[PDB]
Amino acid sequence: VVSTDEYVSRTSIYYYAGSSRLLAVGNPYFSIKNPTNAKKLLVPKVSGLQYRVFRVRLPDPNKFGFPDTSFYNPDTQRLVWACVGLEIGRGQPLGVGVSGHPYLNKFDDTETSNRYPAQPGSDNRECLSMDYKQTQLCLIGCKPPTGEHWGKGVATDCPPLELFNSIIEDGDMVDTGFGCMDFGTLQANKSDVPIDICNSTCKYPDYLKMASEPYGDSLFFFLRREQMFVRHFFNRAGKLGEAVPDDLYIKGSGNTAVIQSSAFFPTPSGSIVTSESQLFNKPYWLQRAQGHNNGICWGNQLFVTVVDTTRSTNMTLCTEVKKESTYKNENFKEYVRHVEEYDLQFVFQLCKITLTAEIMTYIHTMDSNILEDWQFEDPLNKYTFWEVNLKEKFSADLDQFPLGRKFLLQSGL
Amino acid sequence: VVSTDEYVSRTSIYYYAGSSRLLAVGNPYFSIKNPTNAKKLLVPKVSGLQYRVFRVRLPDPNKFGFPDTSFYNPDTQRLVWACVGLEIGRGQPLGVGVSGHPYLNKFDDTETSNRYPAQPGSDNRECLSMDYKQTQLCLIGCKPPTGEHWGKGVASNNNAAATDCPPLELFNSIIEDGDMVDTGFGCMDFGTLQANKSDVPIDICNSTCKYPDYLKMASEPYGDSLFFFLRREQMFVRHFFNRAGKLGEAVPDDLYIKGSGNTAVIQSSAFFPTPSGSIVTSESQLFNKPYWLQRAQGHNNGICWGNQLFVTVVDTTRSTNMTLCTEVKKESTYKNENFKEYVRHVEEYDLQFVFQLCKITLTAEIMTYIHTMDSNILEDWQFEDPLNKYTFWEVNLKEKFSADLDQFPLGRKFLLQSGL
Amino acid sequence: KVVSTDEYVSRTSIYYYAGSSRLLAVGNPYFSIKNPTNAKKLLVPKVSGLQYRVFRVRLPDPNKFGFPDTSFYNPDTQRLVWACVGLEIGRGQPLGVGVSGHPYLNKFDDTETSNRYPAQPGSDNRECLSMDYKQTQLCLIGCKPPTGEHWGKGVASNTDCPPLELFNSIIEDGDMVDTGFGCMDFGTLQANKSDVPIDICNSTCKYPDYLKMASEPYGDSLFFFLRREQMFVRHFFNRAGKLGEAVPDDLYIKGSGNTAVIQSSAFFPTPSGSIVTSESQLFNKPYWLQRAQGHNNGICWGNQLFVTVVDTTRSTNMTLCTEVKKESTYKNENFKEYVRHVEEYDLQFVFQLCKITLTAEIMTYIHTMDSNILEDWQFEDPLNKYTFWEVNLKEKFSADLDQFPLGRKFLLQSGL
Amino acid sequence: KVVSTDEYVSRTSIYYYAGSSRLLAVGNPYFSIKNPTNAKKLLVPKVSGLQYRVFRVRLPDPNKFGFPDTSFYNPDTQRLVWACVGLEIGRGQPLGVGVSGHPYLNKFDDTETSNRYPAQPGSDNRECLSMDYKQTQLCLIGCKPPTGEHWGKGVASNNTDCPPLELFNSIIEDGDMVDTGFGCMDFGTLQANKSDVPIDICNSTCKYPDYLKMASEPYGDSLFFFLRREQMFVRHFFNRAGKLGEAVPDDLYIKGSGNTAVIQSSAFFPTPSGSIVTSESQLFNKPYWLQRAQGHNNGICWGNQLFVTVVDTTRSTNMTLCTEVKKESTYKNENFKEYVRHVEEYDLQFVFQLCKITLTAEIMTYIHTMDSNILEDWQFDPLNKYTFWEVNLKEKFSADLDQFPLGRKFLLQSGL
């Protein structure tokens, strides 16, 4: 495997493309179905802790209406776009939202005072909330990102754990402080984590697997910033599945004869968000990727993956059902909505490849579909991505646009 | 007595080696037997507060299949690998786990309100938890690291009168894989020095917490222990408690005026704090970035004697403990007796190395130096292993060495950095 | 009239290394325990992270040292002296924080959020509370022991508040640093012995008088120093006991009924040293003593040097527990609890050999500065009344800076 | 037309050191203690870390100074003036935080988490609370006393009864209180209950430096140089007792009923906290080189005087003193008296540059417009009504800068 600087010839033709305003509005905890088809969403789940995986569609340069095609020979060459600049615009103010569970499996507060004897009832769940771990990240490539999470493996009665790799889809949940796991399958009570992840799979980017792939199509460039601390200390209700061994304590008696549950769990906190720590609203110049793919958008497509918990503010909405002169709780309905604002901006460089017998063999082994589409079913359609169609958004006047002006100053053109 | 840069000749031959994905899955608090008798683990001990001591096995370059061996003469020279690049990959998200004890010897909260008289009873232990001190460190050498801890000393004199506090002795020992790092209660043998086994959480209460004896390892003559190291520790006091039980050393009378009535019975001044490692951040990460071992501070400039390498890692920044829950009986209403709760912790590593081939001409002056330094070097060169009693995470790279540095991530980083 | 030690101390190219090896202190962080048999001999010494470590480092007399070649100076007209050019204060043990308290702490009400009227005052309302002290790092190096400051009882002259006087004194090994309650003689100025935790309540906390030591003419006290202090207020309490200075009537409108009896305005805070981090460490790194701010540029007169260290970042107090009676069920009456604290030091030095030609002009200058210099050169010791941690390096000098760690760091820095 | 004093003040190569030596202030951090009769006789002065320290530094008149060689200028056409080129504000005492409170603080309910209806009934619900103030470090240097700002009671209304507010400018005097987190205001006049803020400011005027006015003055005599560092956060949330003077309008809420019919007071107020003090954030104990001022006066000490204004809350530690009235074998509160004391330690160090001015007809006209007193004092006090800490350096000037710490720093910095 060689670099795309040894067989992809760079041209001096640059183009701008922008997504304009992208908006997502919904409920941060769960979706609302249609009263006509359960399997049809009326209000989608939109949360600051969701992955935003943008599948960016580029116009086929081999079919693009260039005013002058004398810069290459279609009899022996084909064209492909190379990403050289990107800025992920983010609207809405900085803030933090909270998530919780009306029946959170919290038993005792194990921070300062939890004396014996225990109070174990058949149902001791509580209505608690918390602020999740703070995470910012962005990934760029011509291949959808690869995530990792823990699920139920193959066969103590503890469920076997297996690390699964999967494509991170738009709407997938990021880790929140409880790990990257399938809460739906590994926590059968549905009450050990808040409702917005309790029946979901939280995925973490498999940076090691994506960095080590031979061609490097997944990670042209990435930034990441995670932070959390332990805010509170609780324990779980229910039978402890793995008792503390006898060599770890001296047995109690009387009021201490019934040992309490050592199934502790912490609540996370993402602490403060600040403008100075933002990874977004600034341009990334994709000059030299660490992998062998230096920003070449094979197949005329690009994947933009974003996590931004720094704007997770959840808005409170309230409606007046009955107008009365004195306040009565039964007169109002409370709702929670969350929004996300994106503005994706790109700078692309047109490239040509002379398809010699050596390069055709190299490209065929790398991806046979590349040569077929060049004229020289899509397995990615089973996944869910936020598609960004830039086929009609390419402009050669980079100065008219913000990111384009930044690009001309950076490159000296 | 001198540096290994004038008798270790550097070549332009470089090789990459990677461990691929390494996973450990187990219980963060204790191991579980299989059973089928003891000494057979069903759930191994895996904790974010454990030392990860990787014994990396390299192929013997004197027996390695180089495509061209005309670069040295085996009649008078021997080959050895030199580490010039390293990146410790870390999977799993950043996070913090908690540890506790269902019978922690905590009596009163001594922070704001603890009025007289005290209410002491034969058993006042409580089910409390805490988040430990945060610690990141990575040590590199061709010799396993040496740790320090406090243990029980020698019975000594004044068996009577005097004080019956156990004698303390500072012990040095090899840090083994799975050993516990200090957590905020010190580097001591909790199993022997805390006989009630209720003063610290269960994951260390019958364990020995070890801290790297940096001063001893830096001062060793040849410098085989620490080619390179990074460290980052932080903690603050989260809560203030005191111990139950008889106070072994009473407060002297010249430090207070005696009480009376309800304050006549003095409370115990055996205080102890709970630690907290505060926040973990990506900006403070020591891992997932390359270390270029250009110039060691010691006399061993990255020469992997014995064709092996030791990478010791502590990383509490990914100590998240996962909660698992199984449904024993499916019913329409929630009942606690219908579920079993479990706690699991995982660790993901991916060790990446770049090595530089080196040759040593065995003159009488160099043979004298190598034999005095370590006679086994010449014997293994032909010109049992006392470390087998210890427990290490072995990483076998004998079949993983590749000369195509551009194909691999760290290799590409090495070529760009060195300008090759 | 004071000149610099660069105008009359000739530098040589001869360097020597010396190291103290492992230095350990093990004891109780709150108090010492005397031997019943010997009132002047100790069974458990007081060892605490809030203590000054004042090392009196003894150097070999270079005028009698066994140099392999002594053709570099003339003993008929010259004398030798060591100059310190490099230092690293090694610190063992992990980073951590210890706590101090008082079983009868004079705390009445928590005055932070809720302290309603009327007050409930009683003849004994002391409590068993603890706290974490102010965090302090410092290192002082010179050929003279450091000068500290603290507040004590002044002279009684014509309110019954004790008169205050700021005293200067030599900081001795084992002296307590200020903990957040100030640099004062708690034994004399706090007669109830319950206003601060027990580890300082009968002690004198001293703060380094940087201004006095920096301004002294010859500059023997501070060749070099580093310092890092930090604290915030964790809790707010008030004192029990009679208020000595009542609030004047022009500062409030009088209460009545349940508010007629004014509560005590003798407030006091609890300190907190906050977090310790590796990035803020002052130790385990070399200090190059190239150019002192004073006129003494690291010349170790009298073949000795004083290193004063405070390091509260490793103040962890270890809990020890012994089993008196082994039973199948846990009973408190079967165990004894103890507290121990330890400190580990490793002092490393690089010295530069110096020669001084004793002209008529220089002999007069040295005689005025310190007559003992010429007398000891042959051309009782008042510091023995003080207590220092003695570090004897007379047999530890080596000219082979190669194998030793700080020497290698020095060779890289100096380019040799 | 204001020009710079680099176009008409000729610089000489004559430099002088001057130091105040150790300055100490000892008193009560909450209030001064007068005589039991005499209005203006102080027994214990008010000394607080939240006070302005405004030093009026007196320099010797260089036109009458005994220079060893006076051949450097011509008195027939020239006059002399001192220029400040170096300054170090030495600070003794340890870093720490003090607390202030009020035994009858007008706090009603804790409005942070739980303040359910109904309101609690009571003609007097004040509480004994304390707090740590906003943290403030600053230093101001000039030849004119600094100008502060504060809010007081304005002029009357032509017919809500809220007192009218007016922003007042005034000279900051030594001992004046800085803002503490409750604003720069005349608490004595604007808070008539004397219970809304702690006692050390409840009958005081808190002033903030009018940086904008002093920066905008034409000649720039107020600010040769300044540093400032402020920080605070909200620690707790309370409300005031007493009638709410301005009711919440009806369009901002739906009226309550039954248990919620009587609205609680929305007159909230927070308690401040200055958070942690650290050595790394210190503004003092370091030299300031006054090379090029932003104003037109580049450090010219007109009138042979200098003003140093300092606020430093990082050493606000209040010491607890306790006296034993009756010595008994058991602790009894009625046997002890509790006191609170605060101290401040200063060491002002200066390097001055001698300057000459050729008094042409154009310059005499320019200086007369600037300040007629300059030429009158040259033979070519309205500030006495104010209270300053007088520092007489007339006999403290020395030409041997190397003998002194800050002087050595000046020679090292300038390369002389």
Author numbering:
A (entry chain B): 21 to 175, 183 to 403, 437 to 473
B (entry chain A): 21 to 403, 437 to 473
C (entry chain C): 20 to 177, 183 to 403, 437 to 473
D (entry chain D): 20 to 178, 183 to 403, 438 to 473
From the article:
HPVs are non-enveloped, double-stranded DNA viruses comprising multiple copies of the major (L1) and minor (L2) capsid proteins. The native T = 7 HPV virion can be mimicked by an empty icosahedral shell, called a virus-like particle (VLP) which consists of 72 L1-only pentamers. High-level neutralizing antibodies elicited by L1 VLPs can block HPV infection; however, protection against HPV infection is type-restricted, and there tends to be little cross-reactivity among HPV types. Each L1 monomer folds into a canonical, eight-stranded β-barrel (BIDG-CHEF), with the strands joined via flexible surface loops (BC, DE, EF, FG, HI).
We solved the crystal structures of pentamers of the lead double and triple chimeric candidates H58-33BC and H58-33BC-52HI to resolutions of 2.5Å and 3.5Å, respectively. By loop swapping with a few aa mutations on HPV58 L1—i.e., S80N, N82T, N84A and V87L for BC loop, T375K, G378S and D383E for HI loop —the resurfaced structural contours of the BC and HI loops of the chimera nearly recapitulate those of the HPV33 BC loop (middle and right) and HPV52 HI loop (right), respectively. These subtle structural resurfacing changes in the engineered regions might provide structural evidence for the cross-protective immunity of the chimeric proteins. H58-33BC-52DE and H58-33BC-52HI also showed high titers (2,280–23,440 and 2,180–87,430, respectively; P < 0.001) as compared with the H58-33BC control. Monkeys (n = 4 per group) were administered with 5 μg of the H58-33BC-52HI chimeric VLPs formulated with aluminum adjuvant at week 0 and 8. Nevertheless, the cross-reactive antibody titers for HPV33 were significantly (26-fold) higher with the chimeric VLPs (960 to 6,290, P < 0.001) than with the HPV58 WT VLPs; reciprocally, the anti-HPV58 antibody titer (6,060 to 40,960) of H58-33BC-52HI was also 54-fold higher than that of HPV33 WT VLPs (P < 0.001). The chimeric VLPs could also elicit a mean neutralization titer of 5,400 (1,780 to 8,460) against HPV52 (middle). Based on our immunogenicity assays in mice and non-human privates, we have successfully generated triple-type chimeric HPV proteins that can simultaneously present three independent immunodominant epitopes, using seven or fewer amino acid substitutions.
